[PDB]
Structure formats: structure tokens, C-alpha cells
Amino acid sequence: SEEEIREAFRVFDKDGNGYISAAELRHVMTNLGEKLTDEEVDEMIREADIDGDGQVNYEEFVQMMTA
């Protein structure tokens, strides 16, 4: 299945565009599930968002390994 990651990312998208605003993603990442570190968050959103706009694409992160 591909819903192993993608279907779990939608559950955060409140825009339905395909890209969430880093700020929101950061607050949920170190809140829901387990507890990571500010380091493991910022760096995670850094390796993904290369543009710097703020709207990071989640499927671009999911289909990354496939790329």
C-alpha cells in the first residue's frame, strides 16, 4: 500500500493543497505521537524545504525515497 505514509500526511493538511506551512507541521511533529527534539524537527523540515517559501510539499517527502 502507499497509504503507509501519504494517507497519514493528509490527516494534517487543512488546506487540501498538498503543502503545509512548516510552522504548523513543526508544532504537531513534536506534539503528536512521540517526542523528538527541536533538532530532529528543524533539520527534518530543512532537508525537505529547499525553497524557503514555507509551504513544504508532503508527498515530495514521501516520494523522496522513491526518487
Binding site: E4, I5, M65
Partner: peptide
């Protein structure tokens, strides 16, 4: 840049463990 695949893996198992954990406790 250094380990994007590693980061990808992080969320991979993160969502996986959470999805099945939510139905466990």
C-alpha cells in the same frame, strides 16, 4: 543534504507505529 532518506524513514515508521498504536493504547 546529509540523510534525507534517513529522515524519510523516521516519519515512515513514525506514522506506522502511531497508526497501530492508536488502536492499541
Amino acid at each position: 543534504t546529509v540523510g534525507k532518506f534517513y529522515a524519510t524513514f523516521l516519519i515512515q515508521e513514525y506514522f506506522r507505529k502511531f497508526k497501530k498504536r492508536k488502536e492499541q493504547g
